[PDB]
Design an enzyme around this catalytic site. Structure first.
Site, PDB file in Angstrom:
ATOM      1  N   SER A   1     -29.642 -19.957  39.874  1.00 15.41           N
ATOM      2  CA  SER A   1     -29.349 -21.384  40.106  1.00 15.41           C
ATOM      3  C   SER A   1     -29.448 -21.663  41.634  1.00 15.41           C
ATOM      4  CB  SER A   1     -27.971 -21.762  39.562  1.00 15.41           C
ATOM      5  OG  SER A   1     -27.716 -23.161  39.576  1.00 15.41           O
ATOM      6  N   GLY A   2     -30.267 -22.656  41.999  1.00 17.01           N
ATOM      7  CA  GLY A   2     -30.533 -23.056  43.382  1.00 17.01           C
ATOM      8  C   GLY A   2     -31.583 -22.226  44.106  1.00 17.01           C
TER       9      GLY A   2
ATOM     10  N   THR B   1     -37.009 -25.918  40.097  1.00 13.91           N
ATOM     11  CA  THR B   1     -37.307 -27.355  39.948  1.00 13.91           C
ATOM     12  C   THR B   1     -38.223 -27.883  41.055  1.00 13.91           C
ATOM     13  OG1 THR B   1     -35.249 -27.616  38.756  1.00 13.91           O
ATOM     14  CG2 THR B   1     -36.315 -29.660  39.488  1.00 13.91           C
TER      15      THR B   1
ATOM     16  N   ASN C   1     -25.776 -25.350  43.181  1.00 14.06           N
ATOM     17  CA  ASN C   1     -26.864 -26.292  43.478  1.00 14.06           C
ATOM     18  C   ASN C   1     -26.381 -27.730  43.374  1.00 14.06           C
ATOM     19  OD1 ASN C   1     -29.470 -27.591  43.693  1.00 14.06           O
ATOM     20  ND2 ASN C   1     -30.377 -26.232  42.162  1.00 14.06           N
TER      21      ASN C   1
ATOM     22  N   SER D   1     -28.455 -29.057  40.325  1.00 12.60           N
ATOM     23  CA  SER D   1     -28.729 -28.064  39.298  1.00 12.60           C
ATOM     24  C   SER D   1     -29.249 -28.664  37.987  1.00 12.60           C
ATOM     25  CB  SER D   1     -27.489 -27.231  39.009  1.00 12.60           C
ATOM     26  OG  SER D   1     -27.742 -26.351  37.923  1.00 12.60           O
ATOM     27  N   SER D   2     -30.293 -28.046  37.423  1.00 10.73           N
ATOM     28  CA  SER D   2     -30.810 -28.421  36.116  1.00 10.73           C
ATOM     29  C   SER D   2     -29.811 -27.876  35.099  1.00 10.73           C
ATOM     30  CB  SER D   2     -32.177 -27.798  35.871  1.00 10.73           C
ATOM     31  OG  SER D   2     -33.050 -28.048  36.956  1.00 10.73           O
TER      32      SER D   2
ATOM     33  N   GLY E   1     -32.316 -19.024  34.945  1.00  4.71           N
ATOM     34  CA  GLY E   1     -32.447 -17.586  35.127  1.00  4.71           C
ATOM     35  C   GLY E   1     -31.180 -16.825  34.797  1.00  4.71           C
TER      36      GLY E   1
ATOM     37  N   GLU F   1     -27.793 -15.006  35.248  1.00  2.00           N
ATOM     38  CA  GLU F   1     -26.649 -15.074  36.155  1.00  2.00           C
ATOM     39  C   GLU F   1     -25.395 -14.615  35.458  1.00  2.00           C
ATOM     40  OE1 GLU F   1     -26.155 -17.900  40.063  1.00  2.00           O
ATOM     41  OE2 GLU F   1     -27.755 -18.179  38.572  1.00  2.00           O
TER      42      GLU F   1
HETATM   43  N1  LIG Z   1     -39.630 -25.328  48.672  1.00  2.00           N
HETATM   44  C1  LIG Z   1     -38.542 -26.036  48.976  1.00  2.00           C
HETATM   45  N2  LIG Z   1     -38.588 -26.875  50.035  1.00  2.00           N
HETATM   46  C2  LIG Z   1     -37.479 -27.535  50.386  1.00  2.00           C
HETATM   47  N3  LIG Z   1     -36.271 -27.502  49.817  1.00  2.00           N
HETATM   48  C3  LIG Z   1     -36.258 -26.674  48.766  1.00  2.00           C
HETATM   49  C4  LIG Z   1     -37.320 -25.924  48.288  1.00  2.00           C
HETATM   50  N4  LIG Z   1     -36.937 -25.176  47.185  1.00  2.00           N
HETATM   51  C5  LIG Z   1     -35.674 -25.489  47.022  1.00  2.00           C
HETATM   52  N5  LIG Z   1     -35.192 -26.373  47.955  1.00  2.00           N
HETATM   53  C6  LIG Z   1     -33.797 -26.767  48.154  1.00  2.00           C
HETATM   54  O1  LIG Z   1     -32.983 -26.047  47.246  1.00  2.00           O
HETATM   55  C7  LIG Z   1     -32.237 -26.954  46.412  1.00  2.00           C
HETATM   56  C8  LIG Z   1     -32.183 -26.388  45.017  1.00  2.00           C
HETATM   57  O2  LIG Z   1     -33.504 -26.340  44.439  1.00  2.00           O
HETATM   58  P1  LIG Z   1     -33.731 -26.344  42.865  1.00  2.00           P
HETATM   59  O3  LIG Z   1     -35.240 -26.252  42.633  1.00  2.00           O
HETATM   60  O4  LIG Z   1     -33.196 -27.538  42.179  1.00  2.00           O
HETATM   61  O5  LIG Z   1     -33.108 -25.025  42.234  1.00  2.00           O
HETATM   62  P2  LIG Z   1     -33.248 -24.343  40.806  1.00  2.00           P
HETATM   63  O6  LIG Z   1     -34.034 -23.012  40.982  1.00  2.00           O
HETATM   64  O7  LIG Z   1     -31.857 -24.091  40.323  1.00  2.00           O
HETATM   65  O8  LIG Z   1     -34.007 -25.339  39.961  1.00  2.00           O
HETATM   66  C9  LIG Z   1     -32.931 -28.307  46.551  1.00  2.00           C
HETATM   67  O9  LIG Z   1     -32.017 -29.374  46.342  1.00  2.00           O
HETATM   68  C10 LIG Z   1     -33.489 -28.259  47.975  1.00  2.00           C
HETATM   69  O10 LIG Z   1     -32.567 -28.690  48.973  1.00  2.00           O
HETATM   70  F1  BEF Z   2     -29.702 -24.906  39.041  1.00  2.00           F
HETATM   71 BE1  BEF Z   2     -30.964 -24.376  38.310  1.00  2.00          BE
HETATM   72  F2  BEF Z   2     -31.965 -25.540  38.103  1.00  2.00           F
HETATM   73  F3  BEF Z   2     -30.569 -23.782  36.934  1.00  2.00           F
HETATM   74 MG   LIG Z   3     -33.890 -26.299  38.274  1.00  2.00          MG
END
Ligand SMILES: Nc1ncnc2c1ncn2[C@@H]1O[C@H](COP(=O)(O)OP(=O)(O)O)[C@@H](O)[C@H]1O
Ligand code: BEF
Ligand SMILES: [Mg+2]
Ligand SMILES: CN(C(=O)NCc1cccc(F)c1Cl)[C@H](COC(=O)Nc1cc2ccccc2cn1)C[C@@H](O)CO
Length: 708
Positions: A147-148, A152, A195, A198-199, A421, A423
């Site tokens: 997570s984070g 996404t 996050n 978070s999704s 993923g 955790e």
């Molecule tokens: N390539 C990236 N460029 C800029 N910020 C990023 C990038 N990847 C992640 N982030 C940062 O990390 C945070 C969490 O990303 P997110 O994709 O939502 O996580 P997850 O893997 O849980 O889906 C975002 O809100 C952003 O601030």
């Molecule tokens: F916070 Be991740 F998108 F599960």
């Molecule tokens: Mg996500």
């Protein structure tokens, strides 16, 4: 005289060998000068400085944990968040905005080979796109991670790359396609300690393509929405973004319309108004309304959606007391019931009666039983989670309706997986089992994909491949969770336990111990509801509390019926209509069957730190993710075999200087030329293997060759 040694702070650290005495080696830390005595086997060979920030780690002469970690660290601090790791890709979340996602950069990656340009998500998205047309086979991009970690963020960059390159600027469909996630995230995402966005669901976005390669449509499937988040949240966390968006943003007229009443007047909002830094909830509400306008949601659709969001909150304001000297449920105040019923378009008396005294058929007679305060609270909670997932499903099927409106399916697709993923938490309930069961299948897919790519490469070169399916290691664990009978699995025993009358969560666990106790991937804990499973990444202690209930997912039949016959057309559409475990196994079978018939591209996301900080890389936490990802098992397997493979024309041109005498003046076959250089070098016949086009070398053989 420089080497990599294990480090408690940095994972690994540069040091110089001062004295050797058998297995014992005394090193001097290249950072503080501190003397450290350690074993020869803890010492890891270091790469030449010509490998500083290497774009593809398959290029490293010394393939080891220490060298890979340093390569990612060097790149990360240079602004370089993408690194190729041979057959897959690695992305370290920068936690800051990088200038690498502009219109100029999109155009630069158009039709470029993976090696022709620096590492990027754009290149994965382009190679898979070009292959889909060239090879005429469906593709997939798997963005995995914690997570984070950046799943996404990367998933969306694939969408924005392909919406530019595969466009017919942008065009109605591509404009709408880019609005799917803004809408879905408003309803399915939440501020978490891990996050801020978070999704709270998993998705597989399928983009459909014309024979020419033009985007023709799209479909999105979602998995495991955390519908329980609607009811209560953990310390410093929020519900779904939409409740904060609506309460913060709604006009004076809308507030009155939908009976909205501030952050502190709702029990389903566990921590009141908690803010998301660098984001305003009112601004996000307008941003969400705009996305729904682009997606073609009529004002009536938008308003009926917010009316449901409001009723979900009101449900969690209904208070049940107990009749004096009984457990019988009483509703002394009708205020919330009246408000929510006005919103759900149903009668308040008929609703009150349906919650306190529901009619139940027994056959032939019908029992009107008075509920306990506990039963009514469970029923209202069960209905609020159920209404919310039904609102997410409606929003989702409407997005899919907008995105497949052309009645075109195409010749191919490019699937984009963005699921939760692995955790390990303090409490790992039934949902975690499903999430961890999913990753047991996604890791088996990756492991087996690398195994096929190698089996095919070894065969092409005519070199002996004495290995069994890498995916088979994760197979007993899967069989402990799925497997219908002979030894019936965890889910199979749940489904069977839900039918027993006297059945309890401890009852289920006792039966699980009795059926799977001595299974290789099973372990008894040390609480009567607890049990352990040895997943690929690690032992997880599961607590089976209310699983029987979770697998059954009961709702009060009486109120669901009233809602099915609501005076409000939208509410009625929501309630227009066997286990949760069986249904999810089906979803996973169908997803795995999909993925198994596409060429997969792996995009392993890494979280730098558990602080949500830029330019801070937690070495031991990055190491913990490469182990979990399969990266460290990969490093091991390729150390065992032949990690470096070089073409004859590239071997001769690169190392002509050393074996100067072996190459006679004249034209000679590439394969023939190298044989003589190899013979002049007096190389051990176990260290090399001559292939059909490339020479296969054991690890550190080419590092020895690196000399001037
Ligand atoms: N390539 C990236 N460029 C800029 N910020 C990023 C990038 N990847 C992640 N982030 C940062 O990390 C945070 C969490 O990303 P997110 O994709 O939502 O996580 P997850 O893997 O849980 O889906 C975002 O809100 C952003 O601030
Ligand atoms: F916070 Be991740 F998108 F599960
Ligand atoms: Mg996500
Ligand atoms: C030798 N090799 C490399 O890429 N080595 C670098 C490397 C491997 C693994 C983890 C890593 F970090 C790194 Cl840098 C290429 C093919 O070999 C693989 O990539 N197998 C592989 C097998 C696995 C088996 C089990 C689990 C994970 C696995 C990952 N991966 C072939 C190259 O010559 C051309 O791309």
């Amino acid at each position: 005289k420089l080497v990599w040694v294990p480090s408690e702070k940095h994972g690994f650290e540069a040091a110089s060998i001062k004295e050797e005495k058998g297995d014992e080696v005394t090193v001097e830390l290249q950072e503080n000068g501190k003397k450290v005595t350690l074993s020869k086997d803890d010492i890891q060979k270091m790469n030449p400085p010509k490998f500083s920030k290497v774009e593809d780690m398959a290029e490293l002469t010394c393939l080891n944990e220490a060298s890979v970690l340093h390569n990612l660290r060097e790149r990360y601090f240079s602004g370089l968040i993408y690194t190729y790791s041979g057959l897959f890709c690695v992305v370290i979340n920068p936690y800051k905005q990088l200038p690498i996602y502009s219109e100029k950069i999109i155009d630069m990656y158009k039709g470029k080979k993976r090696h022709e340009m620096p590492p990027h998500i754009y290149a994965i998205a382009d190679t898979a796109y070009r292959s889909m047309l060239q090879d005429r086979e469906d593709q997939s991009i798997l963005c995995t991670g914690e997570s984070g970690a950046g799943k996404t963020e990367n998933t969306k960059k694939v969408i924005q790359y392909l919406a530019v390159v595969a466009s017919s600027p942008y065009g109605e469909l591509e404009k709408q396609l880019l609005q799917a996630n803004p809408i879905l995230e408003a309803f399915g995402n939440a501020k978490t300690v891990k996050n801020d966005n978070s999704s709270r669901f998993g998705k597989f976005i399928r983009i459909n393509f014309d024979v020419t390669g033009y985007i023709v449509g799209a479909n999105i499937e979602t998995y495991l929405l955390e519908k329980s988040r609607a009811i209560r949240q953990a310390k410093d966390e929020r519900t779904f973004h939409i409740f904060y968006y609506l309460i913060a943003g709604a006009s004076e007229q809308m507030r009155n319309d939908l009976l909205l009443e501030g952050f502190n007047n709702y029990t389903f909002l566990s921590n009141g108004h908690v803010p998301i830094p660098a984001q305003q909830d009112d601004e996000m509400f307008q941003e969400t309304l705009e996305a729904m306008t682009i997606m073609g949601f009529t004002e009536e659709e938008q308003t009926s959606i917010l009316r449901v969001v409001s009723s979900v909150l009101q449900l969690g304001n209904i208070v049940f007391k107990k009749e004096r000297n009984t457990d019988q449920a009483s509703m002394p105040d009708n205020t919330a019931a009246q408000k929510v019923c006005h919103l759900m378009g149903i009668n308040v008396t008929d609703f009150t009666r349906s919650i306190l005294t529901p009619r139940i058929k027994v056959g032939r007679d019908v029992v009107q039983k008075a509920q306990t305060k506990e039963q009514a609270d469970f029923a209202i909670e069960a209905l609020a989670k159920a209404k919310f997932e039904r609102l997410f499903r409606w929003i989702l099927t409407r997005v899919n309706k907008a995105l497949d409106k052309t009645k075109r399916q195409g010749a191919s697709f490019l699937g984009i997986l963005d699921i939760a993923g692995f955790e390990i938490f303090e409490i790992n309930s039934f949902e975690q089992l499903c999430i961890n069961y999913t990753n047991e299948k996604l890791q088996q897919l990756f492991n087996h994909t690398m195994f096929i790519l190698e089996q095919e490469e070894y065969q092409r070169e005519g070199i002996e491949w004495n290995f069994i399916d890498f995916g088979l290691d994760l197979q007993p664990c899967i069989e402990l969770i799925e497997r219908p009978t002979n030894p019936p699995g965890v889910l199979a025993l749940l489904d069977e336990e839900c039918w027993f009358p006297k059945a309890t969560d401890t009852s289920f666990v006792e039966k699980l111990i009795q059926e799977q106790g001595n299974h290789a991937k099973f372990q008894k804990s040390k609480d009567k509801t607890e049990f352990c499973i040895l997943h690929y990444a690690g032992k997880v202690t599961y607590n089976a509390s209310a699983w029987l209930t979770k697998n059954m997912d009961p709702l009060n039949d009486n109120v669901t019926s009233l809602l099915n016959q609501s005076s409000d057309k939208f509410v009625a559409d929501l309630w227009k209509d066997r286990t949760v475990g069986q249904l999810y196994k089906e979803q996973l079978t169908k997803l795995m069957t999909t993925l198994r018939n596409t060429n997969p591209n792996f995009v392993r996301c890494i979280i730098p730190n558990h602080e949500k900080r830029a330019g801070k890389l937690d070495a031991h936490l990055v190491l913990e993710q490469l182990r979990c990802n399969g990266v460290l098992e990969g490093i091991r397997i390729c150390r065992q075999g032949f990690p470096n493979r070089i073409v004859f024309q590239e071997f001769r041109q690169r190392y002509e200087i050393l074996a100067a005498n072996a190459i006679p003046k004249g034209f000679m076959d590439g394969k023939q030329a190298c044989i003589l250089m190899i013979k002049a070098l007096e190389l051990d016949p176990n260290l090399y293997r001559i292939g059909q086009s490339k020479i296969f070398f054991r690890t550190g053989v080419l590092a020895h060759l690196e000399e001037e």
